[PDB]
Amino acid sequence: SGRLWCKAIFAGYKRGLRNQREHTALLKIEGVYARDETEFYLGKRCAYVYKAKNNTVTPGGKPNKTRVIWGKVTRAHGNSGMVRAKFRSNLPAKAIGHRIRVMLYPSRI
Amino acid sequence: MKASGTLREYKVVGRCLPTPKCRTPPLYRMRIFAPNHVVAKSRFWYFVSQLKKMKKSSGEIVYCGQVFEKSPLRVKNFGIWLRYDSRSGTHNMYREYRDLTTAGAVTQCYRDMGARHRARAHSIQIMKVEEIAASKCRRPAVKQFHDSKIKFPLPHRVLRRQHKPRFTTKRPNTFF
Amino acid sequence: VFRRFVEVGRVAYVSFGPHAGKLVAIVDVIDQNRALVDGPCTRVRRQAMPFKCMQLTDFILKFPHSARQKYVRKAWEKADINTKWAATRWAKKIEARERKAKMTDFDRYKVMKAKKMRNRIIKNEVKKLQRAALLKAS
Amino acid sequence: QVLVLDGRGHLLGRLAAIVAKQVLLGRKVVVVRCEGINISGNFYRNKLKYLAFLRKRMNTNPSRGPYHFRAPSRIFWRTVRGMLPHKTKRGQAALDRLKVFDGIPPPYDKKKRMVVPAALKVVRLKPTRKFAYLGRLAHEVGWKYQAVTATLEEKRKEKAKIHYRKKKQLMRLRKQAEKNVEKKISKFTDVLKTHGLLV
Amino acid sequence: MKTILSNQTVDIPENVDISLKGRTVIVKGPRGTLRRDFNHINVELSLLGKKKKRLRVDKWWGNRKELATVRTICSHVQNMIKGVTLGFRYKMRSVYAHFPINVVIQENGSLVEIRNFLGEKYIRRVRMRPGVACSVSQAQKDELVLEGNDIELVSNSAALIQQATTVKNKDIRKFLDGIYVSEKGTVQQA
RNA sequence: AGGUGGCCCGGGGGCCCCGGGUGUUACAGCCCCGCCCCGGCAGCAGCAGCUCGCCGAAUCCCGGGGCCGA
RNA sequence: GGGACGGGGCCACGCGAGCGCACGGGGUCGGCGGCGAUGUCGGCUACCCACCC
RNA sequence: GCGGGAUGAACCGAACGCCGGGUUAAGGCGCCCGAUGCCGACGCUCAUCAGACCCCAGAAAAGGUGUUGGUUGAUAUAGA
RNA sequence: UUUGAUCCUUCGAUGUCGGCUCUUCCUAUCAUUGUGAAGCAGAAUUCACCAAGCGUUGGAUUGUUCACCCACUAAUAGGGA
RNA sequence: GGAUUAUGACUGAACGCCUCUAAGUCAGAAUCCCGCCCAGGCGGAACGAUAGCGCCGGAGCCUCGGUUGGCCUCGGAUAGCCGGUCCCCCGCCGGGGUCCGGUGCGGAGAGCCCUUCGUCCCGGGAAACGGGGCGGCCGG
Ligand SMILES: [Mg+2]
Ligand SMILES: [Mg+2]
Ligand SMILES: [Mg+2]
Ligand SMILES: [Mg+2]
Ligand SMILES: [Mg+2]
Ligand SMILES: [Mg+2]
Ligand SMILES: [Mg+2]
Ligand SMILES: [Mg+2]
Ligand SMILES: [Mg+2]
Ligand SMILES: [Mg+2]
């Protein structure tokens, strides 16, 4: 009856300086501040939840108005705690700064 | 030379090769400071090809080996005779330090000549490094650590880990 | 003002680095910012260690400024530092952050189940010691 | 969910280097009392560094010229606008999260304010150097409102001395009922010490 | 280089009891109290001894730019003790060749009008610093005596009536006028 | 002698330190040399998880993350 | 020659017959679960609009 | 043509079928702007015009008791 | 702000000397403001520093920019776009 | 009117003497900056008058989206601070001194308060001045 996910703020695609590759999107995780901690968050199923106008189906429920885009966490990035993520379909530019979820459940403990 | 890392300490003995002219040649030897066992060789043919008519194509490095320190647990007062060129005219110097090993008192010598003279790594000829008892030191940055009852506090401890508590609430303390 | 001094024969406490949280002494001062440091009982080898990774307490022990490894062990286990360090009010709140980091989730549940009744009692005493100072005042 | 910040003792570039990242990462920040900020270097050099910016007006119609703001708020907002892409809709939709005040308004006085340690003069400056205030600077360069700010920053210090006295007055009562009771909470502490809470 | 230690001490005579709270000193005695705060200099003031019979000041780990601050506080303290026990008296003459210099004190020692200087009708409404009590001398033709305790309030106000009266547009090898300073002294004598 | 048992001259406290001088292990200690099987023992580029290196026919085993199956 | 009870390693010691595991000449399941008729499941492309570069 | 030098026909890296994964070069890592949110290491330097990276967008002879090192002889318990 | 040297851009056209009128700008300052040195006694005059806010004229002859001369004045300083 | 340049001075070391300077302090101008003076921003405020219209608690319908526990407060020093005693001098309880405890901050934001599976029986503890719903005032 509480939150069973962890907060994660989307930050930017994997870009150079005068290109960009949108198939690998960065994340920051509140609580982790080094590359030595981020060995807990490898292979964890991350997600993204938005909402729209029309009504869509929902597995185990009446058709709501909300939608999702699932994904996966592949590898680390930087020496600070940033981490990459590979979504199935590439993300919009509307969400720079908004909230995505990461789960925990493909655990390794 | 690229004074990278800490300077290890090699001892090199070398010679020219035998001819029908002379039966056996005499053998020479120096003391070369180098990061590895290759640029000690390329430094050896410069300090030999600056004193005697011997080139690399007419010699062989007989032995090039590391020399450990006889006592790396004592504290020693070194003294170095330098010879460095400059933007206009070369000079000699004599400068002392205070360290354990000659390897660290020359890592220190190259780093202080970089700081105070902008003498580059390819302009420095180390001719002589001798440790000294405490009486014949002349410079005041060593003779001041000559006291049995030395005593000083640590006055102003500036803190680190500036960004782990990055958004705290309380002001720090720098008195300890 | 100053009270804690760097002096030949003072026990410091290495804060960070490879040797995390060990008492160690000071044998000698090389330069402005470097020394010669040894602790034989807390599993340390005689080496060279800077001053930016040690915070220092009010224990001294008397020995010469280049003394070898025995006279320290005599002055150390003479004054018995390995009990007075553990008897200070300074290294009990280290193992307190260790017990706090090593807390099982059941042993977190027995704290949520111990504060919640514990501070509804203090609040039911402060409610009577506000107006145990208000019956006299009014 | 909303940050607050003080402005005493913090630098100008170091604070705006934390804040222009934390805004773009979705976090509403309010920085209050931006006249206690101090600047590196001595005074008269930062005043000639600023009057050489006040001399730069667009020549043919200065009303289109560089709008020289004079308050210490719209100076701190100036030197954040430089650290942001203020031509695009991810800059203009970030500056409406930041909110800067001169002095300290009543909506943000009865709240605990956070203090950045990485941008303080006593940390990031050698103590044998010179620093210069910003308030006395703006007064020297055309700000008319120190005779109001100094007394409205006097009436709240007088209100918070009172709030600290009644904070001490409830704390002593707490440590005396915590001295009377502990006969009957003797068992709810031998379970806390072995988990590390009262050492 | 970095010198590790430098100190200096001051003996205090027993008509004066001194203390310090933090870094600002206070010295009281026969003529009043004086306080001077040294909060910009960053040294260590220690006061050794029962009965407080002398003072000592240190500075650890300082270069040439701040070994200067060992003695120039001992001087502003010996001056702090002198300005409480003895007290200062600056005597200053009044040179004139042809016109009469008129000197008149307003406000019971706290203001000086000056008339008839080089024939200028322009009176000079010179104000002192709070702390200094001027006077016309006695047993001398033309002389002022300024009295007080703090030397910083004495000497600047003394130099004010030395710079108030200058010479415009002419020689100062020939036109030698003004109220010049003769002797620096104390009120009473040991 | 990077000046300690003592000894001896000087100023502070309710014997102790901090002061300057004298001289050989002093009621502290270091260093250099001879001999006692390169004196004896553990151990060994050290699990006192960092005093200083180069290596693998003189080197092999487990476990974790990602992408792809034509 | 043993030294008068000695432990580990040697691809030494012109039709043999049947069975099985396999780090073996480029992936298979001889494994599963919830959603579906007037409100919902699919359609990259082609139409309008927003955003990152 | 491409990544870097803010920008640029020639400089420095490198030479191209359409695409997934990894690693690097010249370069770079307070923010714009991907990367040090290292307990980085040793020192010099305060400017009322500091200063900051090949080709490159500017500057000198001479001066200074401003400072940090150095060099040669002549006064040191020879009270200098 | 002079003249030279070169020839990169425009010859399917950038309207080419002087003056009248009209805003702004620089300082290498003629005068005025505040201050130093003189072989500066006063009066006059020469020398330098911070400094460009404010001023720097009326007329005869020449197509003139340039020159030359008569008066007044605090001063009749020099130039770019 | 304020802050100051140029330059002129004070105390005072480095260099046991000196010295306007290195730390600190004073006077100072046709310049700079503000007022007086002219316009009043995709900037606000107070007060009025309010035509089938507003002040006040029901099932329903279209659209616009981001959120998934809160922290209800001293000021300041950094070669120094925090708390009890205000035993005692002073201000209408406040600060000042003496003294007692902490001081890599435990009266710690490395932190503290709230904690959500539901209900029915039976007891042990802790509440009893308790829990919840309405008439008397201010903080401003
Ligand atoms: Mg005259
Ligand atoms: Mg460029
Ligand atoms: Mg090349
Ligand atoms: Mg860049
Ligand atoms: Mg054309
Ligand atoms: Mg045309
Ligand atoms: Mg000029
Ligand atoms: Mg004024
Ligand atoms: Mg003034
Ligand atoms: Mg939701």
Half-sphere exposure of D182 (CA within 13 A, CB side): 8
Distance B1 CA to I15 C1' (A): 70
| Cα–Cα distance measured from residue D33 to residue C77, given in angstroms and rounded to the nearest whole number | 56
* DSSP code of residue E117: B
Chain C residue numbers touching D177 (CB-CB < 8 A): 122, 125-126, 129
Separation of CA D65 from chain center: 30
- Mapped onto helix, strand or coil, the DSSP state of residue E44 is strand
State the residue for tokens 């690399």: B56
Amino acid making up residue A23: H
User: Rounded to an integer, what distance in angstroms lies between the CA atom of residue E189 and that of residue D120?
Assistant: 52
User: What is the distance between the alpha carbons of residues A103 and A5, in angstroms, rounded to a whole number?
Assistant: 5
Radius of gyration of chain E (CA): 21
Tokens of C7: 């002096």
Q: Are C54 and C11 in contact (CB under 8 A)?
A: no
Strand-pair category, D99-100 with D28-31:
parallel
| Contact residues for strand I with beta carbon within 7 Å | D 59; E 166, 168-174
Strand partners, E7: E58
CA angle D137, D141, D147 (to 5 degrees): 70
End-to-end CA distance of chain C: 49
- Could you check: is the Cβ of residue A107 within 7 Å of any atom of nucleic acid strand H? no
For residue E61, give the nearest of D42, B99, C2 by alpha carbon: C2
Report which of B11, B40, B43 is spatially closest to residue B28, judged by C-alpha positions.
Answer: B11
Pairing of strands C28-29, C23-24: unpaired
- Model resolution, angstroms: 3.8
- Amino acid identity at D71: A
For residue E54, give Cα distances in angstroms to D184, E19, E36, E47.
57, 11, 18, 7
Q: Is D15 exposed, middle or buried (0-12, 13-18, 19+ CB in 10 A)?
A: buried
Tokens of C75: 């002055």
Q: Is E42 left (phi over 0), alpha (psi -120 to 50) or beta?
A: left
Amino acid in position C20? A
How far is Cα of residue E34 from the mean position of the Cα atoms in its chain?
Answer: 13
**Using an 8 Å Cβ cutoff, are A20 and A13 in contact?**
yes
Q: Which residues contact C115 (CB under 8 A, 6 or more apart)?
A: none
- What region does D179 belong to: left with phi over 0, alpha with psi -120 to 50, or beta? alpha
Contact B29, B11 (CB under 8 A): yes
| Strands of chain D, DSSP E | 2-5, 28-31, 38-40, 99-100, 131-133
* Cβ pair E144, E128 in contact under 8 A: no
The CB-side HSE value for C62 (13 A sphere, CA atoms) comes to 1
> Are C65 and B98 an interchain contact pair (Cβ–Cβ within 8 Å)?
no
- With CA atoms as reference, the chain D residue closest to E62 would be D128
Tokens (6 digits) for D82: 């430089």
User: What residues have CB less than 8 Å from B33, skipping those under 6 apart?
Assistant: B7, B8, B9, B10, B40, B102, B103, B106, B126
Please, which positions of strand J sit below 7 A from a protein CB?
A: 2-4, 8-15, 22-27, 32-34, 63-81, 83-84, 93-97, 102-117, 125-130
Residue C46 · residue C69 · CB < 8 Å:
yes
Q: How far is CA D184 from the centre of its chain?
A: 46
User: Of B35, B32, B37, B34, which is closest to residue B47 (Cα–Cα)?
Assistant: B32
CA atoms within 13 A of residue B145's CA, in its CB half-sphere = 20
- Check: CB of residue C118 under 8 Å from CB of residue D185: yes
Q: β-pairing, B128-132 with B77-84?
A: antiparallel
Structure tokens given for B85: 């060129």
- Looking up tokens 């991350």 gives A46
Phi and psi at residue D152, to the nearest 5°: -85, -15
**Contact indicator for B61, B12 with CB cutoff of 8 Å:** yes
**Å separating the CA of residue E156 from the C1' of nucleotide I55:** 41
What tokens appear for C101 in the block? 């980091």
Query: E162: helix, coil or strand?
Result: helix
- Closest residue, chain C, to B72 (C-alpha): C47
**Separation in Å, CA C122 to CA A30, A46, C68, D166, D181:** 35, 45, 57, 18, 8
Experimental method: cryo-EM
Coil/strand/helix, residue E153 = helix
Q: Is the CB of D24 under 7 A from strand H?
A: yes
CA dist B126 and E178 (Å) reads 69
Min Cα distance E151 → chain C (Å) is 30
Helix (H, G, I), strand (E, B) or coil at D109: coil
Residue E63: both structure tokens together: 């270069």
C-alpha span between D74 and D101 (Å, rounded): 9
Interatomic CA distance for residues B130 and B111, integer angstroms: 19
DSSP 8-state assignment for residue D148 = H
Q: After which residues is chain A discontinuous, taking C to N > 2.5 Å?
A: none
SS3 D122: helix
- Residues 6 or more apart in contact with residue E8 via CB below 8 angstroms: E56, E57, E70, E71, E74
Nearest Cα to Cα of residue D49 among D80, D14, D86, D75: D75
Residue C23: DSSP 8-state: E
Which among D93, D91, D71 has a CA at the least distance from the CA of D83?
A: D91
Q: What is the dihedral of CA D54, D57, D61, D62, to 10 degrees?
A: -20
The C-alpha atoms of residue E160 and residue E111 are separated, in whole angstroms, by 12
Q: Do residues E118 and E99 lie in contact, with contact meaning Cβ atoms separated by under 8 Å?
A: yes
For residue A10, what are the contacts with CB-CB under 8 A and spacing of at least 6? A25, A26, A27, A48, A91, A95, A96, A97, A98, A99, A100
Do E137 and E143 meet the contact criterion of CB atoms below 8 Å apart? yes
Query: Are D26 and A98 within 8 A, CB to CB?
Result: yes
Q: What's the longest Cα–Cα distance across chain A?
A: 46
Residues paired with residue A64 on neighbouring β-strands, in sequence order: none
C77 CA to H27 C1' in angstroms comes to 58
Contact between E95 and E176 under an 8 Å Cβ cutoff? The reply is yes
Report the b/e string of B75-91 with b at 16+ CB within 10 A. Answer: bbbbbbebebeeeeeee
Strand-pairing partners, residue A61, are: A58
Q: Which two tokens stand for residue D144?
A: 């008319």
Is residue B154 within 8 A of residue B110, CB to CB? The reply is no
Say yes or no for a CB contact (<8 Å) between C1 and E44. Answer: yes
Task: Please tell me what DSSP assigns to residue B148.
Answer: S
Report CA-CA distances (Å) from B9 to B5, B51, B104, C81.
13, 22, 10, 41
**How many CB atoms lie under 10 A from the CB of residue C29?**
22
Query: Which residues of C are less than 8 Å from B160 in CB distance?
Result: 52
List C-alpha distances in Å: E113 to B112, D25, E100, E136: 65, 70, 14, 12
- CA-nearest of D33, D8, D3, D34 to D19 is D3
Q: How far apart are CA A15 and CA A19, in angstroms?
A: 6
Residue with tokens 């004495």: E154
Query: Rounded distance, CA D131 to CA E122, Å?
Result: 43
Q: Is the CB of A103 under 7 A from strand H?
A: no
Nearest residue of chain E to residue B143 (CA atoms):
E3
Query: Rounded to an integer, what distance in angstroms lies between the CA atom of residue A48 and that of residue C92?
Result: 46
Angle between helices C106-130 and D155-180 (to 10 degrees): 110
- Determine the distance in angstroms separating the CA of E44 from the nearest CA of chain C, rounded to an integer: 6
What span, in angstroms and rounded, lies between the C-alpha atoms of D175 and D183? Answer: 14
Contact predicate E18/E33, CB 8 Å: no
Which ranges of chain E does DSSP label H, i.e. alpha helix?
A: 71-85, 151-163
DSSP for C57-109, written as a single string? EEEE----TT--HHHHHHHHHHHTHHHHSTTSSSSHHHHHHHHHHT--SHHHH
Tokens of C72: 């320290």
Question: CB E7: neighbour CB atoms within 10 A?
Answer: 13
Pairing, β B28-34 against β A21-28: unpaired
